[PDB]
Protein backbone atom coordinates (compact mmCIF):
# COMPACT_ATOMS: atom_id res chain seq x y z
CA UNK A 1 0.00 0.00 0.00
CA UNK A 2 1.64 3.33 -1.08
CA UNK A 3 2.08 5.83 1.74
CA UNK A 4 1.26 9.41 0.74
CA UNK A 5 2.15 12.68 2.45
CA UNK A 6 0.20 15.65 1.04
CA UNK A 7 0.89 19.33 1.68
CA UNK A 8 0.08 22.56 -0.06
CA UNK A 9 1.40 26.06 -0.52
CA UNK A 10 -0.09 29.39 -1.64
CA UNK A 11 2.26 31.78 -3.41
CA UNK A 12 1.26 35.39 -4.02
CA UNK A 13 3.56 37.13 -6.48
CA UNK A 14 3.14 40.86 -5.90
CA UNK A 15 3.97 43.59 -8.41
CA UNK A 16 3.54 41.13 -11.25
CA UNK A 17 3.75 43.93 -13.84
CA UNK A 18 7.32 44.63 -12.64
CA UNK A 19 8.57 41.30 -13.92
CA UNK A 20 11.36 41.99 -16.38
CA UNK A 21 10.74 42.41 -20.09
CA UNK A 22 14.07 40.82 -21.01
CA UNK A 23 14.31 37.03 -21.18
CA UNK A 24 15.81 34.91 -18.43
CA UNK A 25 14.13 36.07 -15.22
CA UNK A 26 13.44 33.35 -12.66
CA UNK A 27 11.34 34.16 -9.61
CA UNK A 28 11.17 31.70 -6.69
CA UNK A 29 8.90 31.33 -3.67
CA UNK A 30 9.91 30.90 -0.07
CA UNK A 31 10.63 27.32 0.87
CA UNK A 32 7.91 25.07 2.27
CA UNK A 33 7.55 21.51 3.54
CA UNK A 34 5.17 19.03 5.02
CA UNK A 35 4.53 19.08 8.74
CA UNK A 36 6.70 15.94 8.96
CA UNK A 37 10.32 16.09 10.19
CA UNK A 38 11.44 14.82 6.78
CA UNK A 39 14.15 17.44 6.11
CA UNK A 40 12.65 18.12 2.69
CA UNK A 41 12.49 21.75 1.56
CA UNK A 42 10.60 22.70 -1.60
CA UNK A 43 9.93 25.87 -3.54
CA UNK A 44 8.12 27.04 -6.66
CA UNK A 45 9.86 28.72 -9.58
CA UNK A 46 8.33 30.82 -12.37
CA UNK A 47 9.80 32.17 -15.58
CA UNK A 48 7.34 35.00 -16.44
CA UNK A 49 8.53 34.97 -20.06
CA UNK A 50 9.32 31.29 -20.45
CA UNK A 51 12.41 29.17 -20.45
CA UNK A 52 13.32 29.47 -24.16
CA UNK A 53 11.99 30.79 -27.47
CA UNK A 54 9.53 27.91 -27.76
CA UNK A 55 7.92 29.02 -24.47
CA UNK A 56 8.37 32.80 -24.83
CA UNK A 57 4.57 33.24 -24.99
CA UNK A 58 4.07 31.48 -21.64
CA UNK A 59 4.73 31.52 -17.97
CA UNK A 60 6.75 28.45 -17.01
CA UNK A 61 6.05 26.98 -13.57
CA UNK A 62 8.00 24.28 -11.74
CA UNK A 63 8.23 22.57 -8.33
CA UNK A 64 11.86 22.44 -7.09
CA UNK A 65 13.19 20.12 -4.40
CA UNK A 66 15.62 22.60 -2.83
CA UNK A 67 16.99 20.44 0.02
CA UNK A 68 16.87 16.66 0.53
CA UNK A 69 19.15 14.26 2.44
CA UNK A 70 17.79 11.20 0.62
CA UNK A 71 18.78 9.92 -2.80
CA UNK A 72 15.27 10.46 -4.20
CA UNK A 73 11.71 11.45 -3.39
CA UNK A 74 8.81 10.56 -5.68
CA UNK A 75 5.94 13.03 -5.80
CA UNK A 76 2.84 14.02 -7.73
CA UNK A 77 2.00 17.71 -7.93
CA UNK A 78 -0.75 20.06 -9.04
CA UNK A 79 -0.68 23.81 -9.75
CA UNK A 80 -3.61 26.24 -10.01
CA UNK A 81 -4.24 29.95 -10.43
CA UNK A 82 -6.71 31.61 -8.09
CA UNK A 83 -8.80 34.28 -9.75
CA UNK A 84 -10.15 37.48 -8.21
CA UNK A 85 -13.09 35.57 -6.68
CA UNK A 86 -10.78 32.91 -5.15
CA UNK A 87 -11.81 30.28 -7.69
CA UNK A 88 -9.66 27.58 -9.26
CA UNK A 89 -8.54 28.42 -12.74
CA UNK A 90 -6.43 26.60 -15.27
CA UNK A 91 -5.15 23.97 -12.85
CA UNK A 92 -3.02 21.14 -14.15
CA UNK A 93 -1.66 18.04 -12.43
CA UNK A 94 1.29 15.73 -13.12
CA UNK A 95 -0.90 12.57 -13.13
CA UNK A 96 2.09 10.36 -12.37
CA UNK A 97 4.72 10.81 -9.69
CA UNK A 98 8.07 12.18 -10.77
CA UNK A 99 11.50 11.41 -9.34
CA UNK A 100 12.98 14.39 -7.45
CA UNK A 101 16.51 14.70 -6.14
CA UNK A 102 18.03 17.72 -4.43
CA UNK A 103 18.27 20.48 -7.05
CA UNK A 104 15.75 18.85 -9.44
CA UNK A 105 12.51 20.43 -10.58
CA UNK A 106 9.47 19.22 -12.52
CA UNK A 107 6.57 21.20 -13.93
CA UNK A 108 5.02 22.83 -17.00
CA UNK A 109 7.11 24.87 -19.43
CA UNK A 110 3.87 26.13 -21.00
CA UNK A 111 1.82 26.53 -17.87
CA UNK A 112 -0.29 29.48 -19.02
CA UNK A 113 -0.18 31.83 -21.98
CA UNK A 114 0.80 35.36 -21.02
CA UNK A 115 -1.91 36.74 -23.32
CA UNK A 116 -4.52 34.90 -21.24
CA UNK A 117 -2.91 35.85 -17.95
CA UNK A 118 -2.64 39.56 -18.81
CA UNK A 119 -6.22 39.85 -20.19
CA UNK A 120 -8.08 41.63 -17.38
CA UNK A 121 -11.33 39.92 -18.36
CA UNK A 122 -9.94 36.71 -16.87
CA UNK A 123 -9.48 38.28 -13.41
CA UNK A 124 -6.11 36.60 -12.75
CA UNK A 125 -3.99 39.64 -11.73
CA UNK A 126 -6.14 41.56 -9.24
CA UNK A 127 -4.19 44.47 -7.77
CA UNK A 128 -1.19 43.37 -9.85
CA UNK A 129 -0.87 40.10 -7.86
CA UNK A 130 -0.66 36.56 -9.22
CA UNK A 131 -1.82 33.90 -6.75
CA UNK A 132 -0.63 30.34 -7.36
CA UNK A 133 -1.64 27.25 -5.41
CA UNK A 134 0.41 24.05 -5.32
CA UNK A 135 -0.49 20.67 -3.82
CA UNK A 136 2.34 18.13 -3.48
CA UNK A 137 1.77 14.41 -2.87
CA UNK A 138 4.98 12.61 -1.77
CA UNK A 139 4.77 8.86 -2.38
CA UNK A 140 6.76 6.63 -0.02
CA UNK A 141 7.28 2.89 0.37
CA UNK B 1 -1.76 28.68 -29.57
CA UNK B 2 -2.93 26.45 -26.73
CA UNK B 3 -3.65 28.36 -23.52
CA UNK B 4 -1.99 25.66 -21.40
CA UNK B 5 -0.02 22.53 -22.32
CA UNK B 6 -0.43 19.70 -19.74
CA UNK B 7 2.92 18.01 -20.52
CA UNK B 8 5.53 17.73 -17.77
CA UNK B 9 9.20 18.60 -18.08
CA UNK B 10 12.24 19.68 -16.08
CA UNK B 11 14.67 22.55 -16.41
CA UNK B 12 17.54 20.03 -16.22
CA UNK B 13 18.40 16.73 -17.86
CA UNK B 14 18.85 13.73 -15.57
CA UNK B 15 19.36 13.58 -11.83
UniProtKB/TrEMBL annotation, chain A:
Entry GO terms, CC: nucleus
Localization in the cell: Nucleus
Pathway recorded for this protein: Protein modification; protein ubiquitination
The entry's keywords: Nucleus, Ubl conjugation pathway
Chief localisation class: nucleus
Coiled-coil portions: none
GO biological process: protein catabolic process
Start and end residues of each MATH domain: 6-136
Family statement drawn from the similarity comment of this UniProt entry: Belongs to the Tdpoz family.
Protein name: Speckle type BTB/POZ protein
Shown stretch of the complete protein: 28 to 166 of 238
Amino acid sequence: APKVVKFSYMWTINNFSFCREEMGEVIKSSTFSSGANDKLKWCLRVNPKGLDEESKDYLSLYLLLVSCPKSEVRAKFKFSILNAKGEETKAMESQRAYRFVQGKDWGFKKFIRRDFLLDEANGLLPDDKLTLFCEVSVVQD
Amino acid sequence: EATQVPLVSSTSEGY
